[PDB]
Amino acid sequence: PYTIELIQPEDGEAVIAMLKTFFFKDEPLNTFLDLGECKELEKYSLKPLPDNCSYKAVNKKGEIIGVFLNGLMRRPSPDDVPEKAADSCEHPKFKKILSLMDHVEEQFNIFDVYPDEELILDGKILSVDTNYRGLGIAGRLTERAYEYMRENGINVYHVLCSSHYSARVMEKLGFHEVFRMQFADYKPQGEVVFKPAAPHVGIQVMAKEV
């Protein structure tokens, strides 16, 4: 009961509104921290849009009922120092999440796995309105990205999952786990930072080569 369309710059507010309703508060790390909604998190979540490769599912009313926000990752130059997102964050709770993301990047480099690639598609947020789940929307959003990839000489779709549920969806769609980081093992200052409810026990980076 829906169409798949490119997310346009005009769509920013509608995307935010949808994530606030269905995505942000059900995320295991946000839940563990009792984070809720905050401006830093919204701005970070919307960062990918101007890359023009994120897709939405839309109902007969023209309402957004699903999104898969994607960004472009270019292989970093020989002389590259990775930016630390947490460095520029003033929100103490959200900063914990960005610190974990920075740590994952320093522990695993997807570009070393695929030496033949200069550009990889990065799947950042996948969310579907509860009322429209079970109808294959995640699969259709993913197939649309494959079409984008073929048009732009991209061969690898990379998706970092902070929720077991997201990772489970990606495995069903044929992605494989290329890296895992257990929360119980994440102790940047000697102490556990994250201990979400089961079954969310670690970050899982999923990949697919098309």
Swiss-Prot record:
Acetyl-CoA binds at L126, S127, V128, G134, L135, G136, I137, A138. Its EC number is 2.3.1.87. The chain holds residues 56 to 265 of 275 of the full protein. Changing H158A: Does not affect catalytic activity. Pathway: Aromatic compound metabolism; melatonin biosynthesis; melatonin from serotonin: step 1/2. It comes from Drosophila melanogaster (Fruit fly). In the adult, expressed in the midgut portion of the thoracic segments and the frontal half of the abdomen (at protein level). Expressed in the epithelial cell layer facing the lumen of the gut (at protein level). In the brain, expressed in a sub-populations of neurons and astrocytes, and in a set of distinct stripes in the optic lobes (at protein level). Expressed mainly in serotonergic neurons but also in subsets of glutamatergic, GABAergic and cholinergic neurons (at protein level). It catalyses: a 2-arylethylamine + acetyl-CoA = an N-acetyl-2-arylethylamine + CoA + H(+); serotonin + acetyl-CoA = N-acetylserotonin + CoA + H(+); dopamine + acetyl-CoA = N-acetyldopamine + CoA + H(+); tyramine + acetyl-CoA = N-acetyltyramine + CoA + H(+). This is Arylalkylamine N-acetyltransferase 1. Changing H200A: Reduces catalytic activity. Optimum temperature is 37 degrees Celsius. Retains 84% of activity when incubated at 4 degrees Celsius for 3 days. Residues 126-199 form the N-acetyltransferase domain. The record marks Y44 as: Might be involved in substrate binding.
